[PDB]
């Protein structure tokens, strides 16, 4: 089977683990240990082909840069997650982008910019327009998700797999 290696990145509390666990187990999990990194694997049928997805749910606790870089180097595609309710998490996405680019050396690395917590529109701090503009600058797609309602959760993982499939 094809094995699509996805890495979740983004600053704290944006929904990396909630997105992962919604995708994996169809549950909205709200208290998942913020410092716990873990990997997940499951079989999925991608455009009719049975494949395996491997998801590395990073937690930013590998502060030792060689280790963090090794984790990123193993990834084939990235979900770069921020929370639409925390502007500082959107600002932080630039750092994850640079980190990935330093390691993968490929500006076309499979990569989605993911604005999570789309069910909290009344708490939005990051405009759709400014996030789309950043994605356009990076030539990546922008998708807004809700790990709570499941909105676009399958989409971000499947579309990222489609980029891995096409590009590698
Ligand atoms: N309302 C809402 N809350 C969310 C969503 N995703 C995550 N959360 C909450 O935000 C907190 C942090 O989520 P988590 O996935 O642990 O963040 P991480 O640090 O990026 O792994 C948790 O308390 C979740 O319940 C979402 O899409 N909508
Ligand atoms: Ca987490």
UniProtKB/Swiss-Prot annotation:
It is found in: Cell membrane; Cleavage furrow; Midbody, Midbody ring; Mitochondrion. Phosphorylated. Changing residue 146 to A: In HINCONS; decreased GTPase activity; increased RALA effector binding. One of its GO terms (molecular function) is myosin binding. Induction: Activated in an LPA-dependent manner by LPAR1 and in an LPA-independent manner by LPAR2. GTP binds at residues 13-18, 29-35, 116-119. One of its GO terms (cellular component) is focal adhesion. The keyword Cell division applies. Its main location: membrane. It is a lipid-anchor. Its EC number is 3.6.5.2. Changing residue 70 to A: No effect on interaction with EXOC8. It is linked to Hiatt-Neu-Cooper neurodevelopmental syndrome: An autosomal dominant neurodevelopmental disorder characterized by global developmental delay, delayed walking or inability to walk, impaired intellectual development, poor or absent speech, axial hypotonia, and facial dysmorphism. Additional variable features may include seizures, autistic or behavioral abnormalities, and brain abnormalities. This is Ras-related protein Ral-A. The gene is RALA. The chain holds residues 12 to 178 of 206 of the full protein.
């Amino acid at each position: 089977l094809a094995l699509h290696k996805v890495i979740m990145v983004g600053s704290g509390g944006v929904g990396k683990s909630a997105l992962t666990l919604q995708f994996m187990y169809d549950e909205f999990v709200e208290d998942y240990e913020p410092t716990k990194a873990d990997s997940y694997r499951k079989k999925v049928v991608l455009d009719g082909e049975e494949v395996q997805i491997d998801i590395l749910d990073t937690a930013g606790q590998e502060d030792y840069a060689a280790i963090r870089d090794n984790y990123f180097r193993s990834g084939e595609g990235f979900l770069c997650v921020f929370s639409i309710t925390e502007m500082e998490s959107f600002a932080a996405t630039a750092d994850f982008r640079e980190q990935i680019l330093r390691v993968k050396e490929d500006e076309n690395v499979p990569f989605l910019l993911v604005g999570n917590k789309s069910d909290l529109e009344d708490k939005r701090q990051v405009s759709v327009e400014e996030a789309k503009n950043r994605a356009e600058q990076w030539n990546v797609n922008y998708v807004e998700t809700s790990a709570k309602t499941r909105a676009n959760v399958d989409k971000v993982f499947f579309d990222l797999m489609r980029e891995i499939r096409a590009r590698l």
